[PDB]
C-alpha cells in the first residue's frame, strides 16, 4: 500500500428560504468524483481502501444577518432515499447542523475492512461506506457556505487502468460497453438526450452520419465546447464542467434512434 | 443573574444520534428516548397556534422508532421523558415557542394563550435559545392502543407546542427524552383485518375502531385507540365516497373511489375515538378492510 | 438385563403442562419446549407410513406456542429438543413407531423402512412403552422464514414418524423438548400483503412466496419460506379456479371461486418452495392478497 489525506470541496448549498429541508446527498468512494476530483486520478492503479481520516467542515463564509440550519451527517449505508423529513434526518447520526453564520466540523467513525472501489457497478453497499448528506432550512437570505472532506486513505493491491469511453449505436441497438459516465436517453418527439453518471470537466469528442437537428446543445451544464459542423455525416467535440451529478446535453436527429458513434473520455 | 448578558446573533446547538439501551424478565423489558416529533413553522401572527401531538407507546405521530416493539407487549411506564427545543435559528428572529404537556393528553387546545399559559408544562421561551421540558411521570400499568378505546385510560395525554412571533424563520426542532416499561409479553399488530359479510360483518382479529353507520346512508368509520396509523383497505361498489374524514388527523387517500377498487390513508389522531367515513348505499353489505396501528 | 421382565397389559404415563422460562440483552433472549406435534393413527399394514413434520422457529405444524415470539426476531439456536412418545395405549396393541430427525429437514421420506431404518434418529420402539428421542444440535446463527427461501439454509430439517402395526389402537402422542436462542431484535409479521396493479404487481412488504405464472394461463402461487401458514386473500374475476395446490401440505379454502370474491387456506409445507395456484386469464391483472406466516 501507498496513502493520502483530504482537501476537496464537495458542492454547496443554496438558500432554502422554505420549512422542510432539502438534501444534496453526495456519495463516498475513492472514485465517485461528485466527491473527489483530486484523488480519482490515483485509483486507476489500485483497488481497495481504507479511510483513517475524513471530516467535513462548514466553512463558514456568510454573515449572521442570515440564519436557519445546515444539517450535515454521514450514514455508512451511503445509499438509500434521504428521507423526506427532518426528524428522519435528525435521527441519523452525523449530528451536526448548526446555523450558517458559524464554523462547524463533522466527523465519521471509519472502519477497517479492505473494501473495493467501482470499476463499475456493483451494489451501492459492498463497494463504498455510504453517501454523505447536507440540508439546510432557512429563509433569511444568503449563499450560506462551503465544505470539503478531511481524509487519509489506503489504496492496497497494485492494479492500474480505467477512463470513462467509446459507445456506438447499431441501427437495431446501441453499444456503452466500455466504461461509463453518461446514459443516453431520449425523450420522444425527437429532441433527445445526452447525459452523465459521473462528475468533473470532460473532453468529448465524437459521434455522426445524418447531421440533422442539431447537436450539441446543452441544458444542466457546464461550459460546452463544440467545434463541429452539424455534420450530416460529420465530426464533433465539447468540454463539459459539470455540476452535480447527472447534468445533460443533446442532439437533435430523427425520430427513431439509429445514427453513428461516440467516445466520452473523462479528463 | 446580573450585569452581563450576551444575546448573541447566533446561538446554536449540536445534537447527535442517540444509539438505544435495555433489562432481565422480572416481568418487563425498557427503553430510552430519541425521537424528533414535527416543527413548527413561523407564526408571524398575534395568537399562538398549536400542533398538539399525542403520547402513547404506539401513536407514531410521536414515536416512529419504538412503535415497533409494542407489538409484542401491552402496558407501560415512562420514567424519563422531556422535550428540548433544540435551538437552530439565529436571534435576528424572535417570539415564543410554548411547549408544555397536559396529562389529559386529549381535549381541545384552547384557542387562547392565557389558556395555554395556565396549563403547567411551563415553558416557552424564545426561538434563539435552547430550552428543555420535563413531565412528572406516574406509576400505573397503563395499556397501549391495539385500538381505540377512550383517549384517557390508555395514554397520559398529548403534548402541545405553540409559537407566536413575526420576525422571520424556521424556528427549531424537538424530541422526547424517555425510558419506558413494557410489561406483559404479548405480540402482534400491523395497520387488524375486519370484513363485512352481506348478512353481517367480521372485527374478529384485534381492534382499534368501531364501524357504525348513521342512517341516511352517510356512514361511520371509527377509533377506540389513539396514535398515527396506516390504513389500508376495503372495496367493491365504489360509491359515494370514501374516505372522507371529520374529527381527524392528517388523511391519506390514494384510492379511486373504486366501484370495485382499493384504498389507503394515514390518520394522526386526536383524542380517542376521532372518526372517518365512506359513502355507499343504503344498507350495509360491501367488501373488507384491515387497520394496522403503526 | 436379564431374567425378568414385565410387559404389562398396560403401561401408561402422566405428563403435565409445561409452564415456560427466559435471559438479559447480550444480544438475545431464549426458550424451552412443550408442544405436542400430531399423532399418529394405526397402520394395521406392512409398510410404514410417515407424517414428516418440519422444524423451524416458525412452522406451526411444529410450534403453535412460540411462533408468536419470532415476529420480533430473526435467527436461532436450539440447545435442547427431544421428542417423546408419550406412551398412552395398552400392550394388547403393537408394531413400531419410528421417530428420528434428519438435519436436512426436507427431502422425500423414503418410501421404505430400511431407508428409514438407515437414517439416524434411531428410535422406534413399540407403541405400549414410553420412549424419547434426541438430536445433536448445532451452533450456527440460522434465520427463520419471513418466507421462503430454500428448505435448507433456513431450518435444520423436518422430523419424521412412522408406525407399522396391525393390532388395534390410537397409539400415542409426542412433543418437542427444546431451548432456543432468538438473536437480533426485529419485529413484524402475520399471514405479508402483495397486490397486483393491472400494469404490475406489488410484494413490497415482507415475503415468503414468489408468484410466477406459467403461460397457458394456469398459473403459479409459491413459497420461499417453510412452516404451517394462514392464507388469507386476493380477488375480482373469480375464474378458473383457485386455490388449487400441488407440492403442498394441507389446504384450506373457504372461498367462492369469487368472480369478485374472498378466500383463505392453511398450508403445511414441505421443503421449501412447495407451490399453490389459481386459474384466471391470460394475462396477469387481478386483485390482491396477504400472506401471514403463522
From Swiss-Prot, chains B, C:
Changing residue 155 to N: In strain: Infectious clone UK. One of its GO terms (molecular function) is structural molecule activity. Its cofactor is Ca(2+). Residues 183-294 are annotated as: P domain, projecting. Changing residue 286 to R: In strain: Infectious clone UK. It is found in: Virion. Binds Ca(2+). Ca(2+) probably promotes virus assembly and stabilize the virus particle. GO terms for biological process: symbiont-mediated suppression of host innate immune response. A motif (GW motif) lies at residues 216-217. Residues 29-182 are annotated as: S domain, virion shell. One of its GO terms (cellular component) is T=3 icosahedral viral capsid. Keywords: Calcium, Capsid protein, Host-virus interaction, Inhibition of host innate immune response by virus, RNA-binding, Suppressor of RNA silencing, T=3 icosahedral capsid protein, Viral immunoevasion, Virion. Belongs to the icosahedral plant coat protein family. Capsid protein self-assembles to form an icosahedral capsid with a T=3 symmetry, about 32-35 nm in diameter, and consisting of 180 capsid proteins. Also acts as a suppressor of RNA-mediated gene silencing known as post-transcriptional gene silencing (PTGS), a mechanism of plant viral defense that limits the accumulation of viral RNAs. May suppress other innate immunity by binding to host TIP protein, thereby preventing it to migrate in the nucleus where it could trigger an antiviral response. Homodimer. Homomultimer. Interacts (via GW motifs) with Arabidopsis thaliana AGO1 and AGO4; these interactions inhibit RNA silencing ability of host AGOs. Interacts with host TIP. This is Capsid protein. The chain holds residues 54 to 351 of 351 of the full protein.
Amino acid at each position: 500500500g501507498i496513502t493520502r489525506s483530504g482537501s476537496e470541496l464537495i458542492t454547496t448549498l443554496k438558500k432554502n428560504t422554505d420549512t422542510e429541508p432539502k438534501y444534496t446527498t453526495a456519495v463516498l468512494n475513492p472514485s465517485e468524483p461528485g466527491t473527489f476530483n483530486q484523488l480519482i486520478k490515483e485509483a486507476a492503479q489500485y483497488e481497495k481502501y481504507r479511510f483513517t481520516s475524513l471530516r467535513f467542515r462548514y466553512s463558514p463564509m456568510s454573515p449572521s444577518t442570515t440564519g436557519g440550519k445546515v444539517a450535515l451527517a454521514f450514514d455508512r449505508d451511503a445509499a438509500k432515499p434521504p428521507p423526506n423529513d427532518l426528524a428522519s434526518l435528525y435521527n441519523i447520526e452525523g449530528c451536526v447542523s448548526s446555523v450558517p453564520w458559524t464554523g462547524f466540523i463533522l466527523t465519521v467513525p471509519t472502519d477497517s475492512t479492505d473494501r473495493f472501489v467501482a470499476d463499475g457497478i456493483s451494489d451501492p453497499k459492498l463497494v463504498d461506506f455510504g453517501k454523505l448528506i447536507m440540508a439546510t432550512y432557512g429563509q433569511g437570505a444568503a449563499q450560506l457556505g462551503e465544505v470539503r472532506v478531511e481524509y487519509t486513505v489506503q489504496l492496497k493491491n497494485r492494479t492500474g487502468s480505467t477512463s470513462a469511453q467509446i459507445g456506438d449505436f447499431a441501427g437495431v441497438k446501441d453499444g456503452p460497453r466500455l466504461v461509463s459516465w453518461s446514459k443516453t436517453k431520449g425523450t420522444a418527439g425527437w429532441e433527445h438526450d445526452c447525459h452523465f453518471l459521473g462528475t468533473g470537466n470532460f473532453s468529448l469528442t465524437l459521434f455522426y452520419e445524418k447531421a440533422p437537428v442539431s447537436g450539441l446543445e446543452n441544458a444542466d451544464a457546464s461550459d460546452f465546447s463544440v467545434l463541429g459542423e452539424a455534420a450530416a455525416g460529420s465530426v464533433q467535440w465539447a468540454g463539459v464542467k459539470v455540476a452535480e451529478r447527472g447534468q445533460g446535453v443533446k442532439m437533435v436527429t430523427t425520430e427513431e434512434q439509429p445514427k453513428g458513434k461516440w467516445q466520452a473520455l473523462r479528463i
